[PDB]
Amino acid sequence: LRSRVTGVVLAAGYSRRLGTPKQLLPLGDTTLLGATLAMARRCPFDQLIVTLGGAADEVLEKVELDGLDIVLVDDAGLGCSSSLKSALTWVDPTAEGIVLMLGDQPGITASAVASLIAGGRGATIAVCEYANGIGHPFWVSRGVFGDLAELHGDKGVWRLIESGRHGVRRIRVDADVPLDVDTWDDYERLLASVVRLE
Numbered sequence: 001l002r003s004r005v006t007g008v009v010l011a012a013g014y015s016r017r018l019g020t021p022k023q024l025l026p027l028g029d030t031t032l033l034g035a036t037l038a039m040a041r042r043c044p045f046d047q048l049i050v051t052l053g054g055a056a057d058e059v060l061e062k063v064e065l066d067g068l069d070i071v072l073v074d075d076a077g078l079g080c081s082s083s084l085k086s087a088l089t090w091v092d093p094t095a096e097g098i099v100l101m102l103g104d105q106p107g108i109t110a111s112a113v114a115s116l117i118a119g120g121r122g123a124t125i126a127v128c129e130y131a132n133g134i135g136h137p138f139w140v141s142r143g144v145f146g147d148l149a150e151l152h153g154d155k156g157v158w159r160l161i162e163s164g165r166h167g168v169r170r171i172r173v174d175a176d177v178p179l180d181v182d183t184w185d186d187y188e189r190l191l192a193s194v195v196r197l198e
């Protein structure tokens with residue numbers, strides 16, 4: 001039972017405020033990126049792509065990436081990455097769309113991804129609607145891969161979503177928006193949640 005979906009975990013850059021590669025931050029028995037990929041592997045994807053930036057060498061040494069398509073890019077500047085452009089070139093032609101998530105959002109669930117994909121069949125874009133706002137994971141149909149490619153950064157998908165040019169389906173998830181990690185404070189907050197829910 002093929003899903004005809006490729007998962008794309010954007011894990012390049014966005015680490016300058018931490019002062020260390022956030023992908024490698026300890027999160028229990030694993031790393032932050034390891035935790036996200038553990039979940040991503042359990043989603044109904046036919047293919048899983050992970051993008052990495054300047055810290056790729058260290059990440060390759062410390063995170064389990066076997067069986068994944070690894071897309072390596074240059075650093076793009078502070079608060080920016082362009083890895084999605086490269087990732088698209090690797091997407092299997094059989095994929096009807098992709099699901100986008102960040103390498104630093106391990107709190108996303110495989111059930112939410114499954115519901116997102118189901119709502120995304122026949123929608124141009126779909127997004128998760130949590131109790132306290134819209135957030136990742138996002139669905140993007142093959143028909144707008146060209147528009148994605150033209151975005152200036154990995155975290156600029158919200159501009160396509162908010163543009164009104166394309167249908168955007170909101171898929172309800174009975175949870176709050178997953179935590180992500182921009183700053184050291186964000187990391188400690190996420191770690192405390194992992195410690196608590198453990």
Ligand SMILES: [Cl-]
Pocket residue numbers: 013014015016017077078079080
């Ligand atoms: Cl940054």
Ligand SMILES: [Cl-]
Pocket residue numbers: 011012013015021052053054055056
């Ligand atoms: Cl990086």
